[PDB]
Design an enzyme around this catalytic site. Structure first.
Site, mmCIF file in Angstrom:
data_model
loop_
_atom_site.group_PDB
_atom_site.id
_atom_site.type_symbol
_atom_site.label_atom_id
_atom_site.label_comp_id
_atom_site.label_asym_id
_atom_site.label_seq_id
_atom_site.Cartn_x
_atom_site.Cartn_y
_atom_site.Cartn_z
ATOM 1 C CG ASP A 65 -1.915 1.186 1.179
ATOM 2 O OD1 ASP A 65 -1.777 2.093 2.016
ATOM 3 O OD2 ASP A 65 -2.779 1.243 0.284
ATOM 4 C CE1 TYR A 75 0.182 7.883 3.350
ATOM 5 C CE2 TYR A 75 0.735 5.691 2.494
ATOM 6 C CZ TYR A 75 -0.175 6.570 3.072
ATOM 7 O OH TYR A 75 -1.447 6.149 3.354
ATOM 8 C CE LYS A 100 -3.861 4.713 0.462
ATOM 9 N NZ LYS A 100 -2.445 4.526 0.848
ATOM 10 C CG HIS A 116 -4.873 9.631 0.292
ATOM 11 N ND1 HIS A 116 -3.500 9.667 0.179
ATOM 12 C CD2 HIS A 116 -5.135 9.173 1.534
ATOM 13 C CE1 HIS A 116 -2.954 9.255 1.308
ATOM 14 N NE2 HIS A 116 -3.925 8.951 2.147
#
Ligand SMILES: NC(=O)c1ccc[n+]([C@@H]2O[C@H](COP(=O)([O-])OP(=O)(O)OC[C@H]3O[C@@H](n4cnc5c(N)ncnc54)[C@H](OP(=O)(O)O)[C@@H]3O)[C@@H](O)[C@H]2O)c1
Ligand SMILES: O=C(O)CCCC[C@@H]1CCSS1
EC number: 1.1.1.21
Length: 315
Positions: free
Chosen positions: A43, A48, A77, A110
């Site tokens: 994932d 991030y 995402k 997201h």
């Protein structure tokens, strides 16, 4: 090995490795170990800030013949600053190049909230609050749909959508592709029985995030609850000769949810995989469900006044 069938005909691994908070200098090794241990589902997300380094590991394992690309299920995402029509393809292509792939298996919206476009992930005004985009969920969905028609992603889905926002998409005039997955926060303190029952009745697979209660979230407090140290869950684990983490990962699996615990620690990555060889009884399950407090880790508190904030509705 086992896997859940999505409405596009693909099969999604029920266990996956999460990568939020995984440092760039640690995550490549983490994903390499995961794939060795037998994870086939990673994932990811642009926000991030480590997709390049996740992509280094995936490339190394592909070169090594450990896995072929069809065996992997890679999820990323679309971030909130990329909700405008003209920006969705670019955001997808940036993620594909960082990860060094030519398609994604699943691409999620997201959050349902769109922010003003720019370099800042959370753009601020002069007062200090998040600036919204005037875009809506349906126009962002139409842009995600054309990524399927162009071959960049195999399936599209959503994340942190409440049932009314999912309804909006399902009722959209000219809907070409149904949401495949709704990724939501889910653990014994936030069991989500109503939203899970609703998504599942419409053929939408649910993915549980923060299954261990996210003990490493940067906004953690000393007086917040801890799932991992909960004595009641410790007792269930002890009865099965497993760890509390193994119990917390097994819990969503028996609810037919996909689960994606995060770890950069090779021995915990290994531990989190050993969850296929035991069962929780229906008594154990019903007991863990009774622990619901309606407590969220991820509440996106800065966007509480956004027109598309998802958590004002009951589910
Ligand atoms: N879609 C969204 O809006 C959204 C939001 C939040 C999260 N997510 C996804 O969900 C993933 C998982 O949730 P999360 O990262 O919030 O947290 P989590 O998986 O619930 O917990 C990760 C934390 O638990 C520790 N841990 C892992 N295994 C453990 C074990 N066996 N024993 C003891 N401690 C253990 C990890 O430490 P070490 O890493 O140091 O081992 C890390 O500190 C994220 O990485 C992300 O991919 C998505
Ligand atoms: O997955 C999420 O939405 C939490 C990470 C966002 C931090 C910026």
């Amino acid at each position: 090995a086992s896997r859940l069938l999505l409405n596009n005909g693909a099969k999604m691994p029920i266990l996956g490795l999460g990568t939020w908070k995984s440092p760039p200098g640690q995550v490549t090794e983490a994903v390499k170990v995961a794939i060795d241990v037998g994870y086939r589902h990673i994932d990811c997300a642009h926000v991030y800030q480590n997709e390049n380094e996740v992509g280094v590991a995936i490339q190394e394992k592909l070169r090594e013949q450990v896995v072929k690309r069809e065996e992997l299920f890679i999820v990323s995402k679309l971030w909130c600053t990329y909700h405008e029509k003209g920006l969705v393809k670019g955001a997808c292509q940036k993620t594909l190049s960082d990860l060094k792939l030519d398609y994604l298996d699943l691409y999620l919206i997201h959050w349902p909230t769109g922010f003003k476009p720019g370099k800042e992930f959370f753009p601020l005004d002069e007062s200090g609050n998040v600036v919204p985009s005037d875009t809506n969920i349906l126009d962002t969905w139409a842009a995600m749909e054309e990524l399927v028609d162009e071959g960049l992603v195999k399936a599209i889905g959503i994340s942190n959508f409440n049932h009314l926002q999912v309804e909006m998409i399902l009722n959209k005039p000219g809907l070409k592709y149904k949401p495949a997955v709704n990724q939501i926060e889910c653990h014994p303190y936030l069991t989500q029985e109503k939203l899970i029952q609703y998504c599942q009745s419409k053929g939408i697979v649910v993915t549980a995030y923060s299954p261990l209660g996210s003990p490493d979230r940067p906004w953690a407090k000393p007086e917040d609850p801890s799932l991992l140290e909960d004595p009641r869950i410790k007792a269930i684990a002890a009865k099965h000769n497993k760890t509390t983490a193994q119990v917390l990962i097994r819990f969503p699996m028996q609810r037919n949810l996909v689960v994606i615990p995060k770890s950069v620690t090779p021995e915990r990555i290994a531990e989190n995989f050993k969850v296929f060889d035991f069962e929780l009884s229906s008594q154990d399950m019903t007991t863990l469900l009774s622990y619901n407090r309606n407590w969220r880790v991820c509440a996106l508190l800065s966007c509480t006044s956004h027109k598309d904030y998802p958590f004002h509705e009951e589910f």
